[PDB]
Tab-separated table of all heavy atoms in Angstrom:
chain	number	residue	atom	x	y	z
A	1	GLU	N	13.668	19.651	-61.076
A	1	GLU	CA	14.902	20.017	-61.764
A	1	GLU	C	14.647	20.996	-62.904
A	1	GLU	O	15.517	21.817	-63.218
A	1	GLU	CB	15.595	18.761	-62.291
A	2	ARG	N	13.471	20.931	-63.531
A	2	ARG	CA	13.187	21.828	-64.650
A	2	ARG	C	13.031	23.272	-64.181
A	2	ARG	O	13.460	24.204	-64.873
A	2	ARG	CB	11.945	21.353	-65.400
A	2	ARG	CG	11.599	22.193	-66.611
A	2	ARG	CD	10.652	21.466	-67.554
A	2	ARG	NE	9.617	20.718	-66.847
A	2	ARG	CZ	9.434	19.407	-66.965
A	2	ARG	NH1	10.210	18.697	-67.774
A	2	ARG	NH2	8.468	18.807	-66.283
A	3	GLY	N	12.413	23.486	-63.019
A	3	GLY	CA	12.502	24.754	-62.324
A	3	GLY	C	11.346	25.720	-62.515
A	3	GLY	O	11.273	26.714	-61.779
A	4	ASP	N	10.449	25.487	-63.472
A	4	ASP	CA	9.308	26.381	-63.650
A	4	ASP	C	7.979	25.697	-63.336
A	4	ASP	O	6.920	26.182	-63.742
A	4	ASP	CB	9.293	26.957	-65.067
A	4	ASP	CG	9.000	25.910	-66.120
A	4	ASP	OD1	9.315	24.719	-65.889
A	4	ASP	OD2	8.449	26.281	-67.179
A	5	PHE	N	8.011	24.589	-62.608
A	5	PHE	CA	6.796	23.845	-62.321
A	5	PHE	C	5.970	24.520	-61.231
A	5	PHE	O	6.506	24.997	-60.226
A	5	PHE	CB	7.154	22.422	-61.895
A	5	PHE	CG	5.971	21.591	-61.523
A	5	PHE	CD1	5.157	21.052	-62.506
A	5	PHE	CD2	5.676	21.338	-60.194
A	5	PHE	CE1	4.058	20.272	-62.169
A	5	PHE	CE2	4.582	20.559	-59.852
A	5	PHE	CZ	3.773	20.027	-60.841
A	6	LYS	N	4.655	24.550	-61.430
A	6	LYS	CA	3.734	24.987	-60.398
A	6	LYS	C	2.755	23.863	-60.086
A	6	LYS	O	2.114	23.333	-61.006
A	6	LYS	CB	2.966	26.239	-60.827
A	6	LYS	CG	3.812	27.509	-60.850
A	6	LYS	CD	3.857	28.197	-59.488
A	6	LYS	CE	4.545	29.559	-59.598
A	6	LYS	NZ	4.434	30.375	-58.357
A	7	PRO	N	2.617	23.469	-58.821
A	7	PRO	CA	1.659	22.415	-58.467
A	7	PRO	C	0.225	22.912	-58.576
A	7	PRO	O	-0.054	24.103	-58.731
A	7	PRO	CB	2.025	22.067	-57.020
A	7	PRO	CG	2.670	23.334	-56.488
A	7	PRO	CD	3.394	23.939	-57.660
A	8	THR	N	-0.700	21.962	-58.488
A	8	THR	CA	-2.114	22.241	-58.715
A	8	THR	C	-2.837	22.337	-57.387
A	8	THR	O	-2.895	21.330	-56.657
A	8	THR	CB	-2.743	21.141	-59.566
A	8	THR	OG1	-2.090	21.091	-60.837
A	8	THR	CG2	-4.232	21.407	-59.772
A	9	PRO	N	-3.418	23.486	-57.035
A	9	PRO	CA	-4.151	23.569	-55.767
A	9	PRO	C	-5.314	22.592	-55.747
A	9	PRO	O	-5.930	22.291	-56.774
A	9	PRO	CB	-4.637	25.021	-55.721
A	9	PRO	CG	-3.720	25.766	-56.641
A	9	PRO	CD	-3.300	24.798	-57.704
A	10	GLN	N	-5.585	22.064	-54.561
A	10	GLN	CA	-6.739	21.196	-54.385
A	10	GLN	C	-8.017	21.981	-54.620
A	10	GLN	O	-8.119	23.155	-54.252
A	10	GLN	CB	-6.737	20.606	-52.976
A	10	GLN	CG	-5.525	19.735	-52.704
A	10	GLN	CD	-5.610	19.049	-51.363
A	10	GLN	OE1	-6.706	18.820	-50.843
A	10	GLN	NE2	-4.449	18.722	-50.788
A	11	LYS	N	-8.988	21.341	-55.271
A	11	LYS	CA	-10.313	21.938	-55.376
A	11	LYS	C	-11.234	21.249	-54.371
A	11	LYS	O	-11.221	21.589	-53.185
A	11	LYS	CB	-10.846	21.839	-56.811
A	12	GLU	N	-12.013	20.267	-54.815
A	12	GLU	CA	-12.833	19.506	-53.882
A	12	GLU	C	-11.946	18.704	-52.936
A	12	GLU	O	-10.903	18.178	-53.336
A	12	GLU	CB	-13.768	18.565	-54.642
A	13	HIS	N	-12.362	18.612	-51.673
A	13	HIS	CA	-11.624	17.804	-50.710
A	13	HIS	C	-12.574	17.289	-49.639
A	13	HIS	O	-13.691	17.786	-49.480
A	13	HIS	CB	-10.478	18.601	-50.077
A	13	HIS	CG	-10.921	19.862	-49.403
A	13	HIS	ND1	-11.338	19.896	-48.090
A	13	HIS	CD2	-11.017	21.132	-49.861
A	13	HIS	CE1	-11.666	21.133	-47.765
A	13	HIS	NE2	-11.481	21.903	-48.822
A	14	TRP	N	-12.111	16.283	-48.901
A	14	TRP	CA	-12.888	15.703	-47.813
A	14	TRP	C	-11.941	15.194	-46.736
A	14	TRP	O	-10.774	14.896	-46.995
A	14	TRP	CB	-13.777	14.561	-48.304
A	14	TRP	CG	-13.011	13.531	-49.041
A	14	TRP	CD1	-12.462	12.386	-48.531
A	14	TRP	CD2	-12.681	13.549	-50.433
A	14	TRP	NE1	-11.818	11.683	-49.528
A	14	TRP	CE2	-11.938	12.376	-50.704
A	14	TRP	CE3	-12.943	14.443	-51.480
A	14	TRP	CZ2	-11.457	12.078	-51.975
A	14	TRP	CZ3	-12.463	14.146	-52.736
A	14	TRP	CH2	-11.731	12.971	-52.977
A	15	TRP	N	-12.466	15.086	-45.523
A	15	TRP	CA	-11.689	14.683	-44.360
A	15	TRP	C	-12.264	13.398	-43.788
A	15	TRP	O	-13.469	13.320	-43.533
A	15	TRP	CB	-11.699	15.770	-43.282
A	15	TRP	CG	-11.017	15.339	-42.025
A	15	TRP	CD1	-11.607	14.844	-40.893
A	15	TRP	CD2	-9.609	15.351	-41.774
A	15	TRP	NE1	-10.646	14.552	-39.951
A	15	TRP	CE2	-9.412	14.858	-40.466
A	15	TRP	CE3	-8.496	15.741	-42.525
A	15	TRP	CZ2	-8.143	14.740	-39.897
A	15	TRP	CZ3	-7.238	15.627	-41.958
A	15	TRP	CH2	-7.073	15.125	-40.656
A	16	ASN	N	-11.407	12.402	-43.588
A	16	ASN	CA	-11.756	11.222	-42.822
A	16	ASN	C	-10.874	11.172	-41.582
A	16	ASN	O	-9.642	11.257	-41.702
A	16	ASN	CB	-11.580	9.930	-43.652
A	16	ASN	CG	-12.529	9.863	-44.838
A	16	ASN	OD1	-13.748	9.989	-44.688
A	16	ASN	ND2	-11.977	9.676	-46.022
A	17	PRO	N	-11.446	11.056	-40.390
A	17	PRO	CA	-10.643	11.059	-39.167
A	17	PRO	C	-9.976	9.705	-38.972
A	17	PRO	O	-10.174	8.771	-39.747
A	17	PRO	CB	-11.677	11.345	-38.074
A	17	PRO	CG	-12.924	10.733	-38.605
A	17	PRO	CD	-12.886	10.938	-40.105
A	18	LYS	N	-9.155	9.626	-37.930
A	18	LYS	CA	-8.661	8.342	-37.471
A	18	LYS	C	-9.836	7.390	-37.275
A	18	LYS	O	-10.873	7.774	-36.728
A	18	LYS	CB	-7.883	8.519	-36.163
A	18	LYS	CG	-6.826	7.461	-35.917
A	18	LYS	CD	-6.098	7.686	-34.598
A	18	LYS	CE	-6.876	7.111	-33.425
A	18	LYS	NZ	-6.854	5.620	-33.438
A	19	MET	N	-9.690	6.163	-37.771
A	19	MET	CA	-10.745	5.167	-37.649
A	19	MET	C	-10.674	4.512	-36.273
A	19	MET	O	-9.607	4.053	-35.852
A	19	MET	CB	-10.611	4.109	-38.744
A	19	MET	CG	-11.687	3.029	-38.702
A	19	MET	SD	-11.524	1.860	-40.060
A	19	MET	CE	-11.894	2.927	-41.478
A	20	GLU	N	-11.809	4.457	-35.583
A	20	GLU	CA	-11.872	3.875	-34.248
A	20	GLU	C	-12.089	2.366	-34.324
A	20	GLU	O	-12.616	1.846	-35.309
A	20	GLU	CB	-12.992	4.522	-33.432
A	20	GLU	CG	-12.922	6.042	-33.338
A	20	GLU	CD	-11.602	6.546	-32.779
A	20	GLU	OE1	-10.969	5.824	-31.979
A	20	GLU	OE2	-11.194	7.672	-33.143
A	21	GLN	N	-11.680	1.662	-33.260
A	21	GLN	CA	-11.780	0.205	-33.280
A	21	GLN	C	-13.227	-0.253	-33.331
A	21	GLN	O	-13.506	-1.358	-33.810
A	21	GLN	CB	-11.091	-0.422	-32.061
A	21	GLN	CG	-9.694	-1.012	-32.316
A	21	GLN	CD	-9.650	-2.212	-33.298
A	21	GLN	OE1	-10.639	-2.925	-33.520
A	21	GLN	NE2	-8.492	-2.426	-33.869
A	22	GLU	N	-14.157	0.567	-32.821
A	22	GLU	CA	-15.567	0.187	-32.849
A	22	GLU	C	-16.018	-0.112	-34.269
A	22	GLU	O	-16.842	-1.007	-34.496
A	22	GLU	CB	-16.432	1.294	-32.235
A	22	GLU	CG	-16.077	1.644	-30.795
A	22	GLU	CD	-14.880	2.580	-30.686
A	22	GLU	OE1	-14.987	3.739	-31.142
A	22	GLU	OE2	-13.833	2.155	-30.151
A	23	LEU	N	-15.476	0.624	-35.241
A	23	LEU	CA	-15.806	0.383	-36.640
A	23	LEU	C	-15.168	-0.902	-37.166
A	23	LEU	O	-15.732	-1.565	-38.045
A	23	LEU	CB	-15.346	1.565	-37.485
A	23	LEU	CG	-16.183	1.803	-38.732
A	23	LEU	CD1	-17.537	2.380	-38.323
A	23	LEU	CD2	-15.447	2.726	-39.686
A	24	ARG	N	-13.994	-1.255	-36.662
A	24	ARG	CA	-13.293	-2.439	-37.157
A	24	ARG	C	-13.789	-3.730	-36.511
A	24	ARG	O	-13.493	-4.816	-37.025
A	24	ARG	CB	-11.782	-2.305	-36.905
A	24	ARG	CG	-11.110	-1.043	-37.488
A	24	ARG	CD	-9.640	-1.029	-37.062
A	24	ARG	NE	-8.936	0.212	-37.379
A	24	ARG	CZ	-8.372	0.479	-38.555
A	24	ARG	NH1	-8.440	-0.403	-39.536
A	24	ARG	NH2	-7.742	1.635	-38.749
A	25	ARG	N	-14.541	-3.641	-35.413
A	25	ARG	CA	-14.776	-4.813	-34.578
A	25	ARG	C	-15.669	-5.825	-35.283
A	25	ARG	O	-16.743	-5.485	-35.785
A	25	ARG	CB	-15.399	-4.402	-33.240
A	25	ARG	CG	-15.604	-5.587	-32.295
A	25	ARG	CD	-16.027	-5.163	-30.898
A	25	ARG	NE	-16.141	-6.315	-30.009
A	25	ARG	CZ	-15.146	-6.809	-29.275
A	25	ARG	NH1	-13.941	-6.256	-29.320
A	25	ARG	NH2	-15.358	-7.862	-28.495
A	26	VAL	N	-15.223	-7.076	-35.302
A	26	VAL	CA	-15.938	-8.154	-35.965
A	26	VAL	C	-16.920	-8.759	-34.975
A	26	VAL	O	-16.528	-9.162	-33.874
A	26	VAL	CB	-14.960	-9.214	-36.494
A	26	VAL	CG1	-15.689	-10.538	-36.774
A	26	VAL	CG2	-14.234	-8.681	-37.752
A	27	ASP	N	-18.197	-8.810	-35.365
A	27	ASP	CA	-19.267	-9.430	-34.584
A	27	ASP	C	-19.756	-10.632	-35.382
A	27	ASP	O	-20.412	-10.468	-36.418
A	27	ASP	CB	-20.396	-8.431	-34.331
A	27	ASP	CG	-21.535	-9.006	-33.490
A	27	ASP	OD1	-21.948	-10.171	-33.688
A	27	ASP	OD2	-22.027	-8.262	-32.621
A	28	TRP	N	-19.439	-11.836	-34.901
A	28	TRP	CA	-19.686	-13.040	-35.689
A	28	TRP	C	-21.167	-13.241	-35.975
A	28	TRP	O	-21.528	-13.766	-37.035
A	28	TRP	CB	-19.116	-14.255	-34.966
A	28	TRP	CG	-17.672	-14.074	-34.672
A	28	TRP	CD1	-17.108	-13.783	-33.459
A	28	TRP	CD2	-16.612	-14.120	-35.611
A	28	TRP	NE1	-15.750	-13.667	-33.594
A	28	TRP	CE2	-15.416	-13.869	-34.905
A	28	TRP	CE3	-16.548	-14.369	-36.986
A	28	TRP	CZ2	-14.177	-13.856	-35.526
A	28	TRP	CZ3	-15.313	-14.362	-37.601
A	28	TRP	CH2	-14.141	-14.103	-36.874
A	29	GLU	N	-22.036	-12.823	-35.062
A	29	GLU	CA	-23.461	-13.047	-35.265
A	29	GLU	C	-24.072	-12.042	-36.233
A	29	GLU	O	-24.981	-12.400	-36.989
A	29	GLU	CB	-24.186	-13.019	-33.920
A	29	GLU	CG	-23.857	-14.238	-33.078
A	29	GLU	CD	-24.453	-14.188	-31.687
A	29	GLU	OE1	-25.298	-13.303	-31.422
A	29	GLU	OE2	-24.069	-15.041	-30.858
A	30	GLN	N	-23.586	-10.800	-36.240
A	30	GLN	CA	-24.129	-9.776	-37.122
A	30	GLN	C	-23.440	-9.703	-38.483
A	30	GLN	O	-24.062	-9.237	-39.443
A	30	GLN	CB	-24.035	-8.400	-36.453
A	30	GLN	CG	-24.833	-8.272	-35.158
A	30	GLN	CD	-26.314	-8.519	-35.368
A	30	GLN	OE1	-26.910	-9.382	-34.718
A	30	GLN	NE2	-26.918	-7.763	-36.280
A	31	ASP	N	-22.190	-10.154	-38.598
A	31	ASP	CA	-21.367	-9.898	-39.780
A	31	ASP	C	-21.344	-11.113	-40.699
A	31	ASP	O	-20.956	-12.205	-40.275
A	31	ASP	CB	-19.939	-9.530	-39.364
A	31	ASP	CG	-19.874	-8.218	-38.601
A	31	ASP	OD1	-20.907	-7.523	-38.516
A	31	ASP	OD2	-18.796	-7.879	-38.080
A	32	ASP	N	-21.720	-10.918	-41.963
A	32	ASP	CA	-21.510	-11.982	-42.928
A	32	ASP	C	-20.031	-12.060	-43.324
A	32	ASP	O	-19.201	-11.229	-42.935
A	32	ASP	CB	-22.417	-11.810	-44.159
A	32	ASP	CG	-22.282	-10.456	-44.840
A	32	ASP	OD1	-21.220	-9.808	-44.750
A	32	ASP	OD2	-23.274	-10.034	-45.487
C-alpha cells in the first residue's frame, strides 16, 4: 500500500528436491 517498496533479491540459496520414501522408511533393526 505504501507503494515505494522494493523486495530483496536472494543472495545465497540452495535446492532440496522432493524427498523420496526411501529416506523416510523406518527400519526397526537399524533405527534407534
Side-chain angles (χ1 to χ4, degrees), residues 2-10 13-32:
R2 182 162 40 239
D4 68 332
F5 178 77
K6 288 273 188 171
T8 299
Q10 298 186 26
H13 57 87
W14 54 93
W15 175 263
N16 295 306
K18 206 180 83 71
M19 181 177 294
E20 305 304 331
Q21 259 296 337
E22 302 81 65
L23 209 73
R24 304 176 189 275
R25 183 171 183 89
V26 162
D27 181 319
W28 304 105
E29 289 175 11
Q30 298 300 124
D31 295 352
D32 55 26

